[PDB]
Amino acid sequence: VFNITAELKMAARRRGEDIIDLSMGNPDGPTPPHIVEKLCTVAQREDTHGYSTSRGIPRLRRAISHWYRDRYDVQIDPESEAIVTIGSKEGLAHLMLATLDHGDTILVPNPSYPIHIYGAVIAGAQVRSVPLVPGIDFFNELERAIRESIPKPRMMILGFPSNPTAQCVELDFFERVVALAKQYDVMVVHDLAYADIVYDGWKAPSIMQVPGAKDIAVEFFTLSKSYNMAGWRIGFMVGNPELVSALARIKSYHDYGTFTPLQVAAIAALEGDQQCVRDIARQYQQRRDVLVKGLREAGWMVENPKASMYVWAKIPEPYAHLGSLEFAKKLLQDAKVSVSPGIGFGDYGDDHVRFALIENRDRLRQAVRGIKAMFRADGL
Amino acid sequence: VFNITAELKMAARRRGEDIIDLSMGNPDGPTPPHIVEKLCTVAQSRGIPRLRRAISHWYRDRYDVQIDPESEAIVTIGSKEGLAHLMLATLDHGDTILVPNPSYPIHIYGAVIAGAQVRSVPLVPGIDFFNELERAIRESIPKPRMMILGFPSNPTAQCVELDFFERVVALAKQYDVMVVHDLAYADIVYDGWKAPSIMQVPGAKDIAVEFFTLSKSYNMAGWRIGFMVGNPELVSALARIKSYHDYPLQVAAIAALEGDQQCVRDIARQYQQRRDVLVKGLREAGWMVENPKASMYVWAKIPEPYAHLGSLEFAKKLLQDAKVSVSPGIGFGDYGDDHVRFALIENRDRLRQAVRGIKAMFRADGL
Amino acid sequence: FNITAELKMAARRRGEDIIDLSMGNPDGPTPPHIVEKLCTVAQRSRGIPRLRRAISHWYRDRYDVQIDPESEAIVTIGSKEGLAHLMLATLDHGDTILVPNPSYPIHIYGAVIAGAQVRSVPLVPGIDFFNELERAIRESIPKPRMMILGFPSNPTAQCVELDFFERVVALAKQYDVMVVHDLAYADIVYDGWKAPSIMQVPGAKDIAVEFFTLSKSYNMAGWRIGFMVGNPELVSALARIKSYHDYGTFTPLQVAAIAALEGDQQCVRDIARQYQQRRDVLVKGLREAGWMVENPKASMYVWAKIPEPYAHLGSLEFAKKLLQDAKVSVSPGIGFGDYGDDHVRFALIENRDRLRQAVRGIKAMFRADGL
Amino acid sequence: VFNITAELKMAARRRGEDIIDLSMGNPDGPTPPHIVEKLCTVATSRGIPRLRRAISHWYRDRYDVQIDPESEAIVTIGSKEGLAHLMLATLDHGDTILVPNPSYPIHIYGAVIAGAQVRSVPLVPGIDFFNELERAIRESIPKPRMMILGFPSNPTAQCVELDFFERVVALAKQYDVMVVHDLAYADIVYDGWKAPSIMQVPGAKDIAVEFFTLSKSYNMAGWRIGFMVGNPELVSALARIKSYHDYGTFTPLQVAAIAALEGDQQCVRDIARQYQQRRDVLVKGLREAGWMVENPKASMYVWAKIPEPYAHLGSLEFAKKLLQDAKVSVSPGIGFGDYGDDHVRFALIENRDRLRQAVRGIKAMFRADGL
Ligand SMILES: Cc1ncc(COP(=O)(O)O)c(C=O)c1O
Ligand SMILES: *Cc1c(COP(=O)(O)O)cnc(C)c1O
């Protein structure tokens, strides 16, 4: 369905229209200079080679261990419990191949990030979606989902802060999941891509802070959003040492490691001064504030996200009959603002659209003006 | 879990106990002698045309339904097998199907063949089955390929009216989800209650198939002869799968269908009287079990004071203390853990003996 | 086989008297003492414990072989269905099995049901079979899970000695490839011969199972009753699979199976010797006509090399010629694998007079043609 | 099984032995500055149009082949991964693919990971490869869906001419078996020899695709960039699976890739020359010691027949001896398929002084063995 709104947008650009594109999570801004300089400097050294070791260069797995200790007081063995990925999409897709085949089911929330589905369907797995929405007991539905699939699902894939809803959970959420996943012996994957994209002084919890999460869980983190990595993919997975090893084995038949100069560049991102991450977080918080306040002054009472790069907006009553896909087309044609239709994230999302905070503030104000002129011209 | 209770039962008889076996669902009764005689005489790809003509007449005479015997009917060696081959023809390996909970698992073998995965759908008092069915469809990605239903129902004895089927069929067509219906207990009905066929619903043949076995109606337990009727493209799919075998009870089985039918009535009558003894008996003992309106089963809710134990442990209690073997409800799914299933497959004297074994158990536990 | 069965029926609807030696179904009646028990018990998960005892005694008295009735034998609803279930128990979807070419396709149903791929191993005169079998084992990755064999063979009638099996078993142990052997035609033996069991090879049960269908030895076509013996862990696999499938094998057939296997074997001796006399009439008639066929020593088939003037036709089109011109239906050899395409199969399923009418139509065809 | 050889090597280093590592074929030389520069200054699923145009020009200039950049070309993330995805897009459980033996093990793996089974076809002096190749097609049911080839070859260094490819293509077209060709070593050619593309065969595109990686030609090892050309449907298939995975655009790397293809091509010739010089030193050195290895005509590899006195040890054991006695790590031929158990592979990935050091170790080992 995102193909549909990608086409309409591109048609609008080719018509010459000035479209505020708030429909993708591609960071707009530049990569921090220390990171780019390392990459370039290391690539230019005659002794450098692109290929590296199966699990990542030891110094980088060390940096990831340190990142866990410092942020979460969590122990990750760099030798056995950490592995460098070529971004989390690669990482996940490969964990699924290693772990899933025809005859297996994974559980995903609805609405959620569709990448987690594709990988599993590509690996041969079936997907069972679990409602994650206001006024439904998630833990009842998750436990139903486990009990009422035969055979039980091998795995459940969660991601907080959430894409697309911006939902944040505290540590007692993770305790429940973990105790539940151990009870039925279902593996937990957790996607921590938005851990640094956090507003109002809040911190994102890792699942690896629960005692014995390592016995049942793995956790993916990507550098894309925290460090504005554009046209570069790198991250890691940690936790259960057998799952880390199964990802290592599958990867050795696919790649020669992550591009070495990018791995060295990741060391410079993860180590040392993290002001560039706080600035990126801050830049999103203020874009959030212009968007949310502006939509509200126009009479669209959108909810204020506590994290992620997304405002997950409930379709106003007077347009609710249209559906998300139809509404998002209207926003594009009438307001000259590209959004993602909520239905693209699962059927429980059809009453919403998602905005990504990827244009600057003036542009955002221009998006708000376009939406407000639409309301006015529709008689609202 | 049935293997668990089939082995404790055989361990009890290993020990010289007089166990009243009400746990299998297999007729004790004699096959009508005219059918057995025709087997003796005969001994001296879609199935025999004659046998396929017989099902067509059957479908017309019972249900006013048109079945073309050239294309819309196929003989099977039983519904487990036929369901296996359909699944094989219709699923990609690993695909999903919908099974009610609680229900008799006629899919297990198909699941082994197709690598099928089951989404269990609650079919229980208190919950809206259609909302749950549509939910399970929607929430499985990709969509399930089929839903397997059976009325009258094993193990619940739940019967349905035509309007259920017109409602399943309308929903099936809405999501292009194939409907398989097992009419195995169509003749075992009580009190002028009657069993509709999903094929009475107009346009059913665009989305549904129906299986019937001879084993319950005619006491042909293990003769394994049945048939499938429905969509002609799915009949043809089965015929392909059967043709890979490249290959007498079929012939004998003609007598069952096109012969005199009083024996089918007499069989249902036998089960009805048996039902009356156990139900009456259990109730004298204060076990206020529901009277079934159809099928060979009494679906008994576990008395509150035995509720804590769960179906498995109550069944162990029953086997140890009352010398009666029952099917624990959880063998039919988690939504059956508060029941047991009795099969009316012993004689009435023996049903009485079981009633007295249950009573005493209750006398000794202070009820 | 469908093609030739359609042309045959076409010819009959046109009023032609076709001598059908194409189908392969026993025409004789089931011995009374067998039928008797089917009737009587009908009126009144591993197989009946008594029937598995009758299998155990069968192997002890015919092959001096110990088969433990409680763990090493199991009753089947025929060998085709029995093989499918074994395959479901031991194959992962998409795995490969080895099969001789040419051979009768008893594997096909299992292959489709278990999702198995097939690798054929040429089994023909002048090709080292063991070379090809091991080569087929080594050139497949992952290793094939099983090889399927059947001696006396359908369609070639080939017979092997006990040494052929001790090499198979020894090879199968080397690579850890399961052996399945089909003893179907063991009792259909001629001229004083006794057919050997793979289970006579010491430690055969470590790597192999053996299947017997009652159909051929006892005129029990359509009865769908046989057994498997061998490895206890493979038998237990089959017992599990079968428990999901059916409540149990039709007891009257099981008790009929006991009459067949226990006691007086005079009726199997008589069936054999009948096939022998039919063999002699067809083999002799065909040679008299300058069709120099091989003579089988077991089984019901005369595996007949296509005469050279008709070799360019292939087995399909030549068999069509037999049907059209001689009024005889044979099974083309290609239906058994491409390495059969210079043969046709004859089944000894008509009476001697009918077999002579065939030989006669065939003689006239050579005479009408150039030969 | 190259894990055993990599573990022994690491053990030796851990003991301070100076090991000349000629096992894993990892290019050791630097990427040309002009390529690497484009990484610094720049920092759909079919690829940047300009890159696909460069691909097109490369096929037109080198081979006189027309490849529509719109429909017949796709940027991969390198051949290893790109092939792995083509396999996931085209293969599942129930398929079999065909691979030579000995051959490049990474093809086998992508296929297996996708769930295909693999049938290997001997490609060795003394055996007729096309006869065995057609047998492998005909004797597997279902018939294999694809065959994967690569010349010049890893590990054997075999080079073929266009005549070879036009017989593959015709055989492929006769049986409708797709053909995958790996052109990774197109530029690593010696002594004026030249490697053809399967696309020079007219109608190749109806049945065939070709992979080329920038890794060897341009010392871009681990850069995760290449492309695939040929059949538009297999190209579209690769395109769709890429969309769903969304592993990334990697414009900087595509941009660098453009610099490789459009830049001065002398660096490629320099790279080939360097390997030709290292080959001259290893071949001449071994021969002076009395090990008369075949001179490769292309590829980073010397494919050395185990000398007769050591033949009996087999390749893994002879490789181990080479590491212990000569202080040289080689890859044992059996890791490439059973038909390679009589060779070892050297990779020309160490400089000439080091190659001299290897040779001296190997000579000292022949001398201590009295051979
Ligand atoms: C939940 C989540 N995980 C991962 C990613 C990005 O993954 P990668 O590291 O491959 O860039 C995103 C970007 O959309 C995301 O939203
Ligand atoms: C091409 C390549 C290889 C190939 O050598 P093998 O030892 O045969 O695997 C290895 N590593 C890299 C980085 C390569 O590019």
Ligand 1 pocket residue status of A112, Cβ below 6 Å: no
Rounded Cα–Cα distance for residues B119 and B138 (Å)? 12
Neighbour count for residue C78 (Cβ, 10 Å): 22
Determine which helix (DSSP H) or strand (DSSP E) holds B238, and give its type and residue range.
helix B232-243
- Alpha-carbon distances of C14 from A136, C8, C17, C289, D19, rounded to whole Å: 73, 10, 9, 28, 85
Contacts of A127 in chain B (CB under 8 A): 140-142
What distance lies between CA C265 and its chain's CA centroid? 20
A176's CB contacts (< 8 A; 6+ apart) are A139
Using a CB–CB cutoff of 8 Å, tell me whether D103 touches chain C: no
Q: In what order do the strands lie in the sheet with C331-332?
A: C301-305, C343-347, C331-332
Q: Which structure tokens are listed for A248?
A: 């290592």
**Distance from the CA of A345 to the center of ligand 1, in angstroms?**
14
Residue A158, classed as helix, strand or coil, is strand
- Torsion angles phi and psi, residue C236, rounded to 5: -60, -35
For chain D, the first-to-last Cα distance in angstroms comes to 29
- The owner of tokens 């994967």 is D148
The answer to whether domain B1-22+261-366 and domain B32-258 are alike in fold is no
List residues forming the annotated binding site of A for pyridoxal 5'-phosphate: 25, 88-89, 163, 194, 222, 224-225, 233, 354
CATH of C1-21+265-370, one of 3.40.720.10, 3.40.640.10, 3.30.465.10, 3.90.1150.10: 3.90.1150.10
Using a CB–CB cutoff of 8 Å, tell me whether C22 touches chain D: no
Give the ligand at the shortest distance from the Cα of A85.
1
Contact D103, D123 (CB under 8 A): yes
Rounded Cα–Cα distance for residues B336 and B316 (Å)? 16
Amino acid at B209: V
Rounded Cα–Cα distance for residues A11 and D16 (Å)? 65
A128, B138: Cβ pair inside 8 Å?
no
Using a CB–CB cutoff of 8 Å, tell me whether B24 touches chain C: yes
Rounded Cα–Cα distance for residues A23 and A324 (Å)? 13
**Distance from the CA of D300 to the center of ligand 2, in angstroms?**
10
A31, D40: Cβ pair inside 8 Å?
no
**Distance from the CA of D26 to the center of ligand 2, in angstroms?**
5
- Helices A88-99, A115-122: inter-axial angle, 10-degree rounding: 40
Contact D157, D303 (CB under 8 A): yes
Using a CB–CB cutoff of 8 Å, tell me whether C49 touches chain B: no
Angle at D279 between CA D275 and CA D280, to 5 degrees: 120
**Distance from the CA of D359 to the center of ligand 2, in angstroms?**
23
Contact D208, D179 (CB under 8 A): yes
Candidates D45, D81, D106: best to mutate against A (most CBs of A within 10 A) is D81
Where do the domains of chain B lie?
1-22+261-366, 32-258
Nearest CA to ligand 1 atom 7: A88
Cα distance from C167 to chain B (closest Cα, Å)? 31
Residue B235, classed as helix, strand or coil, is helix
- Alpha-carbon distances of B195 from B61, B78, B151, B271, rounded to whole Å: 14, 20, 8, 16
List the resolution, Å. Answer: 2.2
Determine which helix (DSSP H) or strand (DSSP E) holds A278, and give its type and residue range.
helix A275-297
* CATH fold label, D32-262: Aspartate Aminotransferase; domain 2 (3.40.640)
Contacts of D101 in chain C (CB under 8 A): 139
Neighbour count for residue B24 (Cβ, 10 Å): 16
* CATH fold label, B1-22+261-366: Aspartate Aminotransferase, domain 1 (3.90.1150)
* CATH fold label, B32-258: Aspartate Aminotransferase; domain 2 (3.40.640)
A49, D39: Cβ pair inside 8 Å?
no
Rounded Cα–Cα distance for residues C6 and C1 (Å)? 9
- Torsion angles phi and psi, residue B93, rounded to 5: -50, 125
Helix residue spans in A86-197 (DSSP H): 88-99, 115-122, 138-147, 171-183
Contact B228, B182 (CB under 8 A): no
Rounded Cα–Cα distance for residues D152 and D160 (Å)? 7
Rounded Cα–Cα distance for residues D30 and D36 (Å)? 10
Rounded Cα–Cα distance for residues D171 and D148 (Å)? 14
Using a CB–CB cutoff of 8 Å, tell me whether C39 touches chain B: yes
* CATH fold label, A32-271: Aspartate Aminotransferase; domain 2 (3.40.640)
Ligand 1 pocket residue status of A119, Cβ below 6 Å: no
CATH of A1-22+274-379, one of 3.40.50.300, 3.40.30.10, 3.40.140.10, 3.90.1150.10: 3.90.1150.10
- Alpha-carbon distances of B20 from A263, B216, B361, rounded to whole Å: 72, 20, 14
Rounded Cα–Cα distance for residues C258 and C314 (Å)? 45
- Residues with CB under 6 Å of ligand 2 are A 51, 256; D 24-27, 154, 215, 221-222
Q: What is the dihedral of CA C184, C186, C188, C189, to 10 degrees?
A: 150
For chain B, the first-to-last Cα distance in angstroms comes to 29
Which CATH architecture is the domain D1-22+265-370 placed in?
Alpha-Beta Complex (3.90)
Give the residue from chain D lying closest to C115, CA to CA. D94
Class of domain C31-262: alpha beta
What's the DSSP call for residue B293? S
Q: What is the dihedral of CA B182, B188, B191, B195, to 10 degrees?
A: 20
Size of interface C-D (CB pairs under 8 A): 49
Nearest CA to ligand 2 atom 6: D25
